[PDB]
Amino acid sequence: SHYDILQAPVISEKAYSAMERGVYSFWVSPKATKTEIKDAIQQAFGVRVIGISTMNVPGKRKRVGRFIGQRNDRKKAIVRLAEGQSIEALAGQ
Amino acid sequence: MKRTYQPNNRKRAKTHGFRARMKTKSGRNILARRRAKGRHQLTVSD
Amino acid sequence: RRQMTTADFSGLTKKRPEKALTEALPKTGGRNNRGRITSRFIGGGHKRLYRIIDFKRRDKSGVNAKVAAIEYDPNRSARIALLHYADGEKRYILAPEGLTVGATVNAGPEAEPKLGNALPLRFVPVGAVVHALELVPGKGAQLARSAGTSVQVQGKESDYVIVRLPSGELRRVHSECYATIGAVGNAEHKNIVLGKAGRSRWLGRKPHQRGSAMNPVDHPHGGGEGRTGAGRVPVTPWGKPTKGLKTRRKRKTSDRFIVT
RNA sequence: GAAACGAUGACUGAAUCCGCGCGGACCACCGCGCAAGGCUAAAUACUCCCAGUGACCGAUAGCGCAUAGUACCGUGAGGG
RNA sequence: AACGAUAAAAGAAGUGAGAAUCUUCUUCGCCGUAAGGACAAGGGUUCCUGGGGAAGGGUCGUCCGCCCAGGGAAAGUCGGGACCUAAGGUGAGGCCGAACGGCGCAGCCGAUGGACAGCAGGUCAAGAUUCCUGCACCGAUCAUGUGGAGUGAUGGAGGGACGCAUUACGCUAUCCAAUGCCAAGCUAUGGCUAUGCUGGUUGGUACGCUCAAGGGCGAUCGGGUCAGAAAAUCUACCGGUCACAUGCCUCAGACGUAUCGGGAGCUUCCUCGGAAGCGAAGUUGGAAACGCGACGGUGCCAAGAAAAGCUUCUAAACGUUGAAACAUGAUUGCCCGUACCGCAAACCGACACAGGUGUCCGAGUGUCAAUGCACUAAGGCGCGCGAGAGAACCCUCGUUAAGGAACUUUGCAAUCUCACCCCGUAACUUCGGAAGAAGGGGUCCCCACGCUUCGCGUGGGGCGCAGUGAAUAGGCCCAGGCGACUGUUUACCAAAAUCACAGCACUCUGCCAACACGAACAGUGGACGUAUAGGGUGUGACGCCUGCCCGGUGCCGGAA
C-alpha cells in the first residue's frame, strides 16, 4: 500500500538543505517504479509531483570477527513538486 | 607478460554458471555433489 | 588474353568486363561440421557473397529472354549471365563462350539449338556441344559448369543419349534432362598463373602441407633424419596412385566405357 | 570340452491330453513335471536421521571442523 | 644482502607527545604521442567530509589507496532493455541413437554491428547531454477546430545495402602573425618609457530577399499475362511521350541582426579562507584535418552481412454525415547502468611488482614532412629509506700518446659512417634491378639583385677549430656455400641451410564424388563446388634438362 513502499527520509547536509528548494528525498523500497512512487508519495502528502529521480545504493562495512561484511542495499528517490509545495508539517525539519 | 587470467564477467557467467550447469547433467551432478560437499558455494554466487 | 605486369615479382591475372553488383544471398566461410576440421585448409578469403543462379531453367519454358549484363562472380569460376524475361522476372544463368550482350535466349522443349538456350537432350542434334546438363529431370545441372568445359552428344539409346563428359568419359544420360547449348566460356583459367603465395589466400587458405615434414605422430611419411619416405600413402594408409576409390553401384550400369 | 539345459541377435517356426518339457551327447525303459498371463507383507540389506551403551578418542587424538567445507588455493572440476 | 630504475632536490613556515618524510609558501629538476586528458573491460566504496595511528606502508608517519563513522551516485533523448539481426546457441513438429543422448525447418535467443528524439552554460566537500536556468525536440492518450473522407495487414515491392587504394573542390574544429581591438600596471639593472612588456580576442538558439563550394533527381500514358503464391494504382519489364548544357532539390559552412551564455579581470566580505557582486574587446592576414559537405571522382581484383524501423500497394475487416493528415494546448514519460581507479598503487600479475591491457583527444618552437628529435604549455610528477665517504672490485658512460686487429673461435664488442641538396656511380643482369653502388661537394650569419610558395638561386661580405654547430642520423666493398624471393617456426638455450611458397608432376574422383567427423540407412563438411573442378602425394621462382634397370615390393589390367 501507500504508507510502506517508501521507507525513511534521507538525512544529510545536502539533503534537507535541498528541502528548501521544494525538493524532498527519501529511501524507498528497492523494487519500485517512478509511477508507483508517484502514486504513493502523492497519496501520502497530498501534493502533485512533477520532478522525479531515483537511484540504487550498496552496503558493506564490517567491524569484528571473521564477519567481513554485508551489503545492506538501499534506494534513494528524490522529488520536486509544482508550485504546490511544503510537504505536511514535516518539511519543516 | 600477459597472465593466464583475463577476467570477463559474461564469460565466467556463460561457462561455469548455474544456468550453465542446467543444460547438462554433468553439471547438475556437480551441483548435488557440491551441495553435499559440505555447504560449499556453487558457482555464480561466488 | 590476360593482364600482365612488368617485372615487380609477378605473372598474369584475368580480364573482367560488364559491371553491375545485383541482388543475391550472403554466404559464410567455414571448413567443417559439428566437430573438428574435415576438408583440410581453405579457411581464408575475401568474404564473398553468393549469387543464387538458375541451373534447371524449367518454368521459363515458352518464354523468351534478353541477356542484360555479364558479371563475374566467385563461387562459380564461370561468367554469370544476367537474364530478363518477358514475364518481368529476372534470373541468373551461366554464360557460354561467345555469348554477346543482349542476345535472345529462349527455354523449353521447342527451343532452337542456339547459344544459351535451354532444351532437353532428345532434341539435341547429333555431335553438338553443350554444357549445364542434369543427371535427372528436374533438380539442376551438375555437368559442365566449370572452367572452360563442355559435353558433346554421342548417340541415342531409348530414353538415353550417349554423352561425353569432360574427363573424356562416355556415359548414358537420359534425354529427359534439360541442357544448354555451348561450352562454358570462363575465359581459360588454366592460363591465369595465380601470382604468388597468398594469391592463394585471396581465394582460400594455406595450401598443401607435406606429411613428410610431419612427425610419426602426425602423418605416415613423418619421422626420419633427412628428406624421404617408404610405402606411399595419405592421412590414412590407402594410397594415392591408381587405387579405384569407387564402389559397386546403380549408375555404374548407366555408365559405359569410363576409361579415364 | 563327449556340453546337456536356461538365455537371447539372425534365419526358421510343432504338437495340444492314446499330448508336451526335463532328467548333462544320444536311445529305450523308468521316474519327476504340466512352460508360453499377472500381483503378492513377512524372515534379508542399508544408516541422512533419533535413543542407548563402550577394557573408543580427549585438543598433532577424535569427523576435515570442540563447527568451517569457513578462511585460504584453483578459470573450473576440485582441494582445504 | 637488500629497501624494487641514477627524473637530483633545497630553504623557510606550520602542526604535533614526537617530523628528512604530513601541511603551506618560495625555488629547483622530470614527462609532455606523456609519465597529460577521456572512455572500455575488470575492480567494488578504494570517491568526499570528520576522525584514527594497531597491523598493513620495504625507514619514518601527525600521513595514506590502511582503520572507524557519516555523506555522496538523480536521465522521455547518453549506453543497454521494453526493437532488429551475424557467427554461435537453441529448438514443438521432424530425422537418428543400449542408456544418459547426437541432430535438426520454422521460430527464438544472441553486439562486436543496423535502427532511434537536445544543445548551451551554472554549480555541493563528493553527481551531471541526469540536478537548475535559458531556449529545444520525440512518441503516446485526449480536448476545440480544420478536413470534411478511407484507413491502407505476420503478405508484395522499394529501401535499408556496405570492398580496397588513390584523389579534385569547399568548410570547420584548430593553430599561427600583427604599430588590429580591450584590460592591467609598473617599468630601475646599461638602455627601452612605448612602436615596450603580460593577458584576453565568441559558444547556443532564432529569423533573415545575404554568400556559398560541394552533394542526388528524370516525369507521366499505357501493354502483356507467362513475373513478384493471390491482389494492386506499388515493383520488374517491351513500347509511346516530354526531358540534350539552362533545369530542378538540399544546403556543410560563412555573413548580418537579435538574444541567451560565456569571457581578461574587476569590486566588496572573509569565520585566515573561500564566498558573493560586477564585467572590456571580440579585428585583419595565414595555415589546416583521418572531421564535415557527401552515399563525391577515377582506377583495381581477391568482387566486398542480415534483419527490422522506413517508403509505396493491395488482401481482410470496420467505415464510406463523425477518415488519413496538420498545429493548438493539455497530460504523459517505466527498467537497468552513471561515484572512484581505469597504460595503473585501485584491472591481470602473492607484492604500493621496471611486466601486460583494447579505443579516443594529445598543444607550441626549431626541423623538407612528421605522432621523429631536442626544449617547453596546460596538466602531472621527482619514483615512501636517509645521510656521509670518495679504497680494491663490480656495473653504465666519457677522453686518450705512438701503433691500428698485432686481439680473438670469429673485429665478439665498440668506433668510424649518418640528415637534406648537388654532382657522380662498376662487374652482372630476369632490363625492374644491382644503387643510398663506389666516390666528390654544399650546409651558419649579414647585404644587394632576382624568383614559381614556405623560401630559393646568383653576387659580394663577416665570424668560429668546426656551421643537418646541440638531439634524432646507413661504414663500405670483392669472392663464395644454402635457400630463389615477402613470409613461417622451437610461449622459456636452436630463426636457420626448417616449414610455407608461386610454378611443375603422379594419381584419385560422374556428384547422395572420391575424401574426412560420427553411438547413427541421422546429420554435416567437401559445396549450395562438378572433372582447365574437388582430394592425396611429392618437388619447389626462373633457365637448360630429368638417363639406364621393373627381378623383388605396391599398383592398375587380364585370363588357361
Ligand SMILES: [Mg+2]
Ligand atoms: Mg571500512
Ligand SMILES: [Mg+2]
Ligand atoms: Mg620434421
Ligand SMILES: [Mg+2]
Ligand atoms: Mg603412423
Ligand SMILES: [Mg+2]
Ligand atoms: Mg617416413
Ligand SMILES: [Mg+2]
Ligand atoms: Mg623505492
Ligand SMILES: [Mg+2]
Ligand atoms: Mg630530483
Ligand SMILES: [Mg+2]
Ligand atoms: Mg624536459
Ligand SMILES: [Mg+2]
Ligand atoms: Mg612503519
Ligand SMILES: [Mg+2]
Ligand atoms: Mg599582445
Ligand SMILES: [Mg+2]
Ligand atoms: Mg612505489
Ligand SMILES: [Mg+2]
Ligand atoms: Mg609537438
Ligand SMILES: [Mg+2]
Ligand atoms: Mg689510443
Ligand SMILES: [Mg+2]
Ligand atoms: Mg692520435
Ligand SMILES: [Mg+2]
Ligand atoms: Mg690475428
Ligand SMILES: [Mg+2]
Ligand atoms: Mg693470437
Ligand SMILES: [Mg+2]
Ligand atoms: Mg659488431
